[PDB]
Structure 1
Amino acid sequence: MNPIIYTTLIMTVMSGTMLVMISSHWLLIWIGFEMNLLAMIPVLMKNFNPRATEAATKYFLTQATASMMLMMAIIINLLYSGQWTITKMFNPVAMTMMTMALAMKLGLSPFHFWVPEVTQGISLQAGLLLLTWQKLAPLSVLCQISQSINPNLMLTMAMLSILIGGWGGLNQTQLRKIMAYSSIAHMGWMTAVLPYNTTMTILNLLIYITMTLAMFMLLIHSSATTTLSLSHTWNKMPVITSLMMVTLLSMGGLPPLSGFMPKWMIIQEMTKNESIIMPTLMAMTALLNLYFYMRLAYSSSLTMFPSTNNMKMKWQFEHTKQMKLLPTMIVLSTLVLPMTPALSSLN
């Protein structure tokens, strides 16, 4: 692919997301989604091979079905109230269809199956984009229509997402599928607090995005897509594996690391309403994500796996391309808890 064409496609993806974020008209929001998908399909196919083509096809089918349901919900809402402005969604059937369409776009359970497959079928850069930038538009719409949400449906989907993310991640040796299941669980956490406080949703999204960016950038720096290939990195660059171990611990939600901050905050918010059983269940379930993060840390940093002879040659060369934002991303992923009250600036 031409670099000019790649830049144009990335800019079109971002423009579709921005159009979703700045629009007041439902038609313009739908157009933003369409433009984002149209530009996103070729980016997933940048390195051409059958797996990338399969991932792109599955992604297109899922997102096109979601957009059809989105448009039908908009039209039903218009039928029962001649309104185009994104507001309290005057019809409940239309609101149910809207919620299901947005959940399918986000990959929330039980519309979760496509996320591990698409993530595994594409490159690490495409996976970074898909798991970070592609969450902004549906979450922005959900934040805008939160007051009309049905808490039962969204809470059911969020709890299912957390459970399924943990259970599915428990079974993986491929790093991209691990990241996808982690994303599913974190989306569940984000949507669990949405009917109560959208500021907490934004805070969780920001912290998750920072940690995911650090994770994907560390995985690109050490060209590993499997557990066994990541188990070699200690014999080439131990600093990368140590930073990865601390980042995994933060993603597990352990204090005093930054990944503990959202869950903590969310739990507190849920106890400001009554909502006692659900946060307890959510934390006990997030223990599963912590377990498979810890297994990855065992494989890559806390023990030393056997290496190969040809690795000696790799000792003689340095990394050519350097990521300028990786150190700041790591620091923000780990040492940010003491600045928790700054979340007031989010609302």
Structure 2
Amino acid sequence: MNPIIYTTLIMTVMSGTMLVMISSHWLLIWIGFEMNLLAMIPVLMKNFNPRATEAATKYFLTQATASMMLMMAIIINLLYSGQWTITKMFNPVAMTMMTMALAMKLGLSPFHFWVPEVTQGISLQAGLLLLTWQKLAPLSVLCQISQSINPNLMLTMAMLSILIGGWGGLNQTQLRKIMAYSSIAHMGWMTAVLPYNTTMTILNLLIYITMTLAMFMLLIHSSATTTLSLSHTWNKMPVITSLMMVTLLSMGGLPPLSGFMPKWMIIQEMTKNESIIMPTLMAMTALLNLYFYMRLAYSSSLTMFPSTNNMKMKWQFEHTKQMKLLPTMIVLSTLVLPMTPALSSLN
């Protein structure tokens, strides 16, 4: 791909997301989603191979189906009320279509099947983009229509997402599939609190995006996509492995790390609404995500795996390209717990 073309496509993806962000008209939100998908499809295929082609095809099919359901829901809402503004949908059936459409776009269970395969089939940069930037628009739409959602369906999908994310991540040796299942579980956590407080959803989004950016950048720096390939990084870059281990502990939600704060705030906010059972199940299930994070940390940093002879040649070379924001993302992913009261600025 020509660098100018790649820049234009990334800017088109971002502009479609911003169009979804700033629109007051349902048609313009649909247009933003369409433009985002159209510019997104080539980015998944930048490095050409059959796996990338398959991932792009599955992504296109899933997102096109979700867009069709989105438009059908918009049309039903228009039919039962001559309204185009995104304030609150006037039909329960149209709202159910809208929820199913946005959940399919986000990859919430049981619409989760595409996320691990698409994530595995693409490069690490495309995986970073897919798992960070692609969540903003549907989450913003869901935030705008929060008062209209049916709590039963949303909470069922969130609980299913958390459970399935944990169980699927338990079985993975490929790092991209691990990150995809982690993303599914985090999406479930985010959508669990949306009917109660959108500020909590925004805070969870920000922290999850920071941790995911740090993790993907650390995986790009140590160019590994499997567990055993990452097991070699200790013999070349021990600092990277130590930072990876600390970031993995943060992603598990352990105090006093940053990943603990969104779960803590979500649990307390849900208890304000006399919801006790479901947050308990949610934390007890996120224990599984912590388990496979700990397995990755065992294989990567806390123990030393055998290495190969050719690593000596790699010892003599530095990294030609450096990531500017990696240091900041690590610090924000780990050491921001004392700054919790700043969340009031998000509302």
Matches within 5 A, 1:264-279: 264-279=264-279
Give the Cα–Cα distance (whole angstroms) in 1 for the partners of residues 170 and 237 of structure 2: 27
Q: CA deviation at 1:255?
A: 0.1
In 2, the alpha carbon distance for the partners of 1:195 and 1:300 equals: 39
> What do the CA deviations read for 1:198-248 (whole angstroms, capped 9, x no partner)?
000000000000000000000000000000000000000100000000000
> Cα deviation per residue 1:111-138 (whole Å; 9 max; x = unaligned)?
0000000000000000000000000000
CA distance in 1, matches of 2:111, 2:258: 29
Question: How big is each residue's C-alpha offset from its partner over 1:154-203, in whole Å with a ceiling of 9 and x where there is no partner?
Answer: 00000000000000000000000000000000000000000000000000
Superposed CA deviations along residues 286-320 of structure 1, whole A, max 9, x for unmatched, are 00000000000000000000000000000000001
State how far apart, in whole Å, the 2-side matches of 1:98 and 1:87 are. 13
- Aligned-pair CA distance for 1:87: 1.2
With structure 1 as the length reference, what TM-score do the two structures score? 1.00
TM-superposition CA deviations, 1:50-91 (whole Å, max 9, x none): 000000000000000000000000000000000000011000
Structure-1 separation of matches of 2:9 and 2:186: 27
Equivalence for 2:246? 246
Say whether residues 1:283 and 2:299 are aligned partners: no
For residue 135 of structure 1, what is the aligned residue in structure 2? 135
Query: Partners in 2 of 1:245 and 1:285 — Cα distance?
Result: 21
Instruction: Determine the C-alpha separation between the residues in 2 that align with 1:163 and 1:66.
Output: 23
Measured after TM superposition, the shift of residue 18 of structure 1 is 0.1
**Unpaired segments ≥5 residues, structure 2:** none
Q: Is 1:5 matched with 2:16?
A: no
Shift of 1:100: 0.1
- Equivalent position of 2:336 in the other structure: 336
Query: Aligned partners of 2:273 and 2:169: how far apart in 1?
Result: 31
Q: Structure 1 vs Structure 2: percent identity of aligned residues?
A: 100
d(CA) in 2 for partners of 1:87, 1:65? 24
Partner deviation per Cα, 1:241-261 (whole Å, 9 max, x = no partner):
000000000000000000000
Structure 1 distance, partners of 2:308, 2:20, is 50
What is the distance in 2 between the residues matched to 1:265 and 1:276? 14
Partner of 1:166: 166
- SS in structure 2 at match of 1:224: coil
Whole-Å separation in 2 of the counterparts to 1:276 and 1:302: 36
Structure 1, residues 12-46: CA drift from partner, whole Å, max 9, x if none? 00000000000000000000000000000000000
TM-superposed CA distance for 1:9, in Å, is 0.1
For residue 196 of structure 1, give the secondary structure of its aligned residue in structure 2.
coil
Cα distance in structure 1, aligned partners of 2:279 and 2:119: 29
- Residue in structure 2 matched with residue 201 of structure 1 by the alignment: 201
2:210 matched residue in structure 1: 210
Give how far 1:268 is off: 0.2
The CA distance in 1 between the partners of 2:237 and 2:90, in whole Å, is: 57
Structure 1 unmatched ranges of 5 or more: none
- Which whole-Å CA distance do the structure 2 matches of 1:66 and 1:74 have between them? 12
Partner of 2:201, secondary structure, is: helix
Q: Report the CA distance between 1:339 and its aligned residue.
A: 0.2
* Runs of 4+ residues over 3 Å off in structure 1: none
Q: Provide the rounded CA distance (Å) in 1 between the counterparts of 2:67 and 2:56.
A: 16
Superposed displacement of residue 264, structure 1: 0.1
TM superposition shift of 1:322: 0.2
Shift of 1:282: 0.1
**CA distance in 1 between partners of 2:283 and 2:153 (Å):** 20
RMSD value, Cα: 0.2
Separation (CA, whole Å) in 2 of partners of 1:219 and 1:262: 24
